[PDB]
Write an enzyme that holds these catalytic residues in place. Structure first.
Site, PDB file in Angstrom:
ATOM      1  NE  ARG A 229      38.439  83.995  73.480  1.00 50.58           N
ATOM      2  CZ  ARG A 229      38.323  85.008  74.328  1.00 50.58           C
ATOM      3  NH1 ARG A 229      38.385  86.251  73.859  1.00 50.58           N
ATOM      4  NH2 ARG A 229      38.129  84.792  75.623  1.00 50.58           N
TER       5      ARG A 229
ATOM      6  CB  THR B 203      34.163  84.036  65.964  1.00 55.14           C
ATOM      7  OG1 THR B 203      32.806  84.407  66.243  1.00 55.14           O
ATOM      8  CG2 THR B 203      34.829  83.536  67.243  1.00 55.14           C
TER       9      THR B 203
ATOM     10  CE  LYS C  26      31.133  80.870  64.192  1.00 59.74           C
ATOM     11  NZ  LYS C  26      30.245  80.581  65.352  1.00 59.74           N
TER      12      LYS C  26
ATOM     13  CE1 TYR D 178      32.507  79.274  67.563  1.00 54.66           C
ATOM     14  CE2 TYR D 178      30.729  77.699  67.965  1.00 54.66           C
ATOM     15  CZ  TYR D 178      31.476  78.793  68.363  1.00 54.66           C
ATOM     16  OH  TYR D 178      31.206  79.395  69.566  1.00 54.66           O
TER      17      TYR D 178
HETATM   18  O1  LIG Z   1      33.918  81.362  70.595  1.00 54.41           O
HETATM   19  C1  LIG Z   1      34.987  80.820  70.451  1.00 54.41           C
HETATM   20  C2  LIG Z   1      35.535  80.469  69.052  1.00 54.41           C
HETATM   21  C3  LIG Z   1      36.508  79.308  69.071  1.00 54.41           C
HETATM   22  C4  LIG Z   1      37.031  79.022  67.678  1.00 54.41           C
HETATM   23  C5  LIG Z   1      37.921  79.873  67.004  1.00 54.41           C
HETATM   24  C6  LIG Z   1      38.409  79.495  65.588  1.00 54.41           C
HETATM   25  C7  LIG Z   1      37.983  78.335  64.978  1.00 54.41           C
HETATM   26  O2  LIG Z   1      38.404  78.003  63.756  1.00 54.41           O
HETATM   27  C8  LIG Z   1      37.008  77.418  65.725  1.00 54.41           C
HETATM   28  C9  LIG Z   1      36.562  77.733  66.983  1.00 54.41           C
HETATM   29  O3  LIG Z   1      37.598  79.474  69.963  1.00 54.41           O
HETATM   30  C10 LIG Z   1      37.294  79.729  71.277  1.00 54.41           C
HETATM   31  C11 LIG Z   1      38.148  79.386  72.300  1.00 54.41           C
HETATM   32  C12 LIG Z   1      37.800  79.673  73.772  1.00 54.41           C
HETATM   33  C13 LIG Z   1      36.607  80.286  74.073  1.00 54.41           C
HETATM   34  C14 LIG Z   1      35.597  80.701  72.983  1.00 54.41           C
HETATM   35  C15 LIG Z   1      35.937  80.435  71.660  1.00 54.41           C
END
Ligand SMILES: O=C1C[C@@H](c2ccc(O)cc2)Oc2ccccc21
Length: 212
Positions: free
Chosen positions: A33, A45, A94, A103
């Site tokens: 993601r 991550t 991460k 996050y």
């Molecule tokens: O597990 C995650 C990480 C998250 C994420 C990615 C980058 C960031 O900067 C902050 C949060 O985005 C997502 C979106 C949808 C489902 C799971 C996730």
């Protein structure tokens, strides 16, 4: 037969055992993601979804004998995985450093949208999300550090944080709310989850298990 999966040098073992519940899980899928910046996908991550071993027998009735291609296009299949009578363990490790608040901001955003979307975002759920937020505030996730979501079928979401990818012995917090307990996984493989990598892994890996 289930194999391990590595995402950006972050490995997800084929099987793991919870130090919290003692239950054992198998890797259902793994992906990544991040954020799309100026049309560029920026990875932040890795994500791995583990299903309790008993998930196979539970899913067998309805999904044994279905092809991977078939499962992938069936929303009901993912609904059974998300709300099935077994524990699910999600491990996010991460790739790029993120503070707990950084996050959790996006995750909570997605969870809240879903909850409101299905008409289950009352005071109890808002409070649960505030507790969710609180648990992340003292935490930082340098590369390799991880977050563990233990989705109990009893309507509880356990939260664990690790400096690396090893699963912690104790959980940092327990979010006791049915609707919120499945929100995190919903945003990953639910109907409105755009990113398909996790869904594809599940559709590809489950058939073999559902037949034996
Ligand atoms: O597990 C995650 C990480 C998250 C994420 C990615 C980058 C960031 O900067 C902050 C949060 O985005 C997502 C979106 C949808 C489902 C799971 C996730």
């Amino acid at each position: 037969s289930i194999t391990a999966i590595t995402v950006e040098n972050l490995e997800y073992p084929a099987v793991v055992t919870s130090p919290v519940t003692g239950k054992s899980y198998f890797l259902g899928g793994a992906g990544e993601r991040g954020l799309t910046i100026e049309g560029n996908f920026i990875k932040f991550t890795a994500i791995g979804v583990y299903l309790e071993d008993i998930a196979v027998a539970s899913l067998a009735a309805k999904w044994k004998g279905k092809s991977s291609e078939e499962l992938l296009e069936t929303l009901d299949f993912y609904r059974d995985i998300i709300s099935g009578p077994f524990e699910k363990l999600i491990r996010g490790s991460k790739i790029r450093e993120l503070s707990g608040p950084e996050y959790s901001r996006k995750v909570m955003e997605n969870c809240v949208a879903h909850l409101k979307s299905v008409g289950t975002y009352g005071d109890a759920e808002a409070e649960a999300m505030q507790k969710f937020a609180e648990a992340f505030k003292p935490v930082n996730f340098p590369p390799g550090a991880s977050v563990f979501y233990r989705q109990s079928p009893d309507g509880i979401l356990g939260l664990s944080f690790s400096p690396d990818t090893s699963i912690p012995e104790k959980e940092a917090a327990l979010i006791e709310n049915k609707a919120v307990s499945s929100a995190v996984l919903e945003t990953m493989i639910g109907e409105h989850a755009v990113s398909p990598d996790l869904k594809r892994c599940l559709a590809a890996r489950l058939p073999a298990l559902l037949n034996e």
